[PDB]
Structure 1
């Protein structure tokens, strides 16, 4: 096989709310594992001991190419944590480039609230930069090792489809899928132009939000609030997460636009699902949300706009098939904005590490209706964009 982009199209699967994973093989002979794709962290780690929620796990003793680094590691996330033993082994991506890399691998020996009951993944691929790797930035992340040992160009792109994913009639109702194109950009995954925002600093995929509109109405906050203490693009986060103050203004504005003031507060807090009769979800009463991002030239921005189909997430197995139920998937953060699957499922997202920038284009698979579509538009003249970034005061 050639490792061409067409072979990589559709190489992700997932269950809604449980991340997206790619198949990988580790060790010699290869052991196949499904690996969550996480642009919000920088460690490659795999279940390496039994766990009630693991269908399979990595067995270092079965691999003649395993090398023990004789160092432990602990990694905490916003939700979940694990610890394990560092080592290196040969790693491949069967529907990725046609190459084999010696990479650092954390062999997970204990964990808490990390693995998800029934999820079909057994490990995590942290795609961000060494600065946020544990135990420290000397543990070269997977994508760095891939680029350094092979000729793969230093970029990847993600198309997360959500419920826009072609399924058989007989597949489980919450299955989602998508593509990770490693080494470039595949033109079948998007429509219109790609628009780029600078990667502000290489640690997380940090970006700068310069304006927010709901229903085309400016939220009118000081733009520093949008990026307090950072804004990141994160495939391993489900929601659009917003700083408290921004969250509260967002909910107020969404309620006002849609006349849902009387919806219970538990709904807005993600503690209750809203249910309508199947087929009758009134999408049109809910507003579009736009984030304007810093552009590539002086005083220039562009915006990405998502629909209620992105921020009201369908939940299966909670009511009769006669009803469609949704979770409000915009939530509060005390660690900055996270553009999770709620944002990424509208767009093809290019993590152009070589040029220190993130591209967005309308996704060919985003969920929308006959009246509205997700959008990426620009250019706009915007002043004082550099002032939008947070700095330690």
Structure 2
């Protein structure tokens, strides 16, 4: 999969994107790679943050579906018109498919100034597609229309402009050059988000000792479309307390722990060793087994270059509170080669050949850990009448 290696780009904290083409003749757009959503949607009208957009009128193969779509979220929305057109990934498989495309005609706090992407590729399942689960997601169409295996894998690699990032999205396979050591699999609990189960959390080798359901309240997901490691309120509080205690030689402002303020050291003198490793134990394929993924401060402290002090190394704390469960975002994924094995309903982790580390510690993937009579760590989201009333024909 040499032709697919190094096909992702982006700016730190602003998402990873892949080049895609839409229409006939092909119109190139940069598309956010998002395992936390399920729509393929592209800017299709002028916007202050867009240099270019999908021009449906220029495409001989465009078909209007005569249906609108409206997608609200916390402090924003995108909306537009549904259609289909021919889509390819220039640095991906040598195939062209007819996919659903949402042509974004209006948005609020969707596009990001300077992110260099013009659309979003939702790689998650139909259950969370808008307007409903009958709108076939891109990857489903790709698999159904081509001989491409039902699997993709992601290797995300972490003064006036933000830092450039790179990575690989390998579609239809696993590239052995992108990882070292063992590849460990956790089950996809349910096909909507890429939902997984965390059975144990340690901070510098010390167990948080919480009821494991707390780790997955109200879900845990693997999400390339979220920058941070996001943790449920109670878990976040325990983690922050433990990390503060380890790094206690340094007294940072409250703003730092909230992700609202940078902390700096003189260039090259960052005391990495005062910050603890964080281990998340994920449910194994075998009932009473787990494996752990371990990340370093190099992953959860994000570099941000400061104009006012360019001779310092400055960092943002990239673990944040969630009210919608654990989110294993770019902070987690940058440690690892992550295999989204849809065919076998499982997610694989191995140490990334590109992860940032030092001479003392490394991001790790280790197992098995067996637990006699393992508890159920999964949370069952209370069923609303809304959800219950839906028929699924």
* TM-score bracket for the superposition, by shorter chain length: over 0.9
1:385 corresponds to: 374
Which 10-residue stretch deviates more, 193-202 or 272-281? 272-281
1:6 to 2, 6, 13: 2
Once the two structures are overlaid, the 10-residue window that deviates more, 259-268 or 103-112, is: 259-268
| Structure 1 counterpart SS, 2:214 | helix
Deviation at 1:260, TM superposition (A): 5.2
Q: Is the CA contact 1:188–1:364 (under 8 Å) kept in the aligned structure 2?
A: yes
CA distance in 1 between partners of 2:359 and 2:281 (Å): 24
Kept in 1, the 8 Å contact 2:306–2:314? The answer is: no
Quote the Cα distance in structure 1 between the aligned partners of 2:31 and 2:2.
20
Compared with structure 1, are the counterparts of its residues 319 and 290 closer, same or farther at alpha carbon in structure 2 (3 Å cutoff)?
farther
Q: Note if contact 2:12-2:162 (Cα within 8 Å) is conserved in structure 1.
A: no
- Post-superposition shift, 1:93? 0.2
Does residue 207 in structure 1 map to residue 196 in structure 2? yes
- Cα separation, 1, equivalents of 2:74 and 2:337: 25
Q: Is the 8 A contact 2:336 2:352 kept in 1?
A: yes
Q: Distance in 2 between matches of 1:8 and 1:77?
A: 32
8 Å contact kept, 2:162–2:304: no
Structure 2 regions of 5+ residues with no counterpart?
383-393
Q: TM-score, normalised by structure 1?
A: 0.95
Deviations along 1:32-84, one digit per CA (max 9) or x if unpaired, are 00000000000000000000001110010110100000111112345642011
Change (3 A) 1:230 1:383: farther
For the 8 Å contact 2:195–2:220, the answer to whether it is kept is yes
CA distance in 2: counterparts of 1:343 and 1:283, whole angstroms: 17
What is the distance in 2 between the residues matched to 1:377 and 1:78?
36
Q: Deviations over 1:185-214 (max 9, x none)?
A: 000000001000000000000000000000
Contact 1:28 1:90 in 2 (8 A): yes
| TM-superposed deviation, 1:112 | 1.0
Which of 175, 178, 188 pairs up with 1:189? 178
Partner Cα separation in structure 1 for residue 331 and residue 158 of structure 2: 9
C-alpha spacing 1:20/1:78, structure 2 compared with 1 (3 Å): farther
For the 8 Å contact 2:41–2:120, the answer to whether it is kept is: yes
Q: 1:79 to 1:339 in 2, by over 3 A?
A: farther
Distance in 1 (alpha carbons) for counterparts of 2:195 and 2:307:
36
Deviation at 1:172, TM superposition (A): 5.9
Q: Secondary structure at the match of 2:2?
A: helix
CA contact 1:159–1:345 (8 Å) conserved in 2: yes
8 Å Cα contact 1:79-1:114 kept in structure 2: no
What secondary structure sits across from 1:387 in the alignment? Answer: coil
Cα offset for 1:98?
0.3
TM-score, normalized by length of structure 2?
0.95
CA distance in 2, matches of 1:386, 1:206: 18
Name structure 1 gaps, 5 residues minimum: 164-170
Deviation at 1:158, TM superposition (A): 0.1
Superposition RMSD in Å: 1.5
Q: Against the structure 1 CA distance between its residues 234 and 111, is the aligned structure 2 distance closer, same or farther, given a 3 Å change threshold?
A: same
- Whether the aligned pair in 1 keeps the contact of 2:266 and 2:313 (CA below 8 Å) is yes
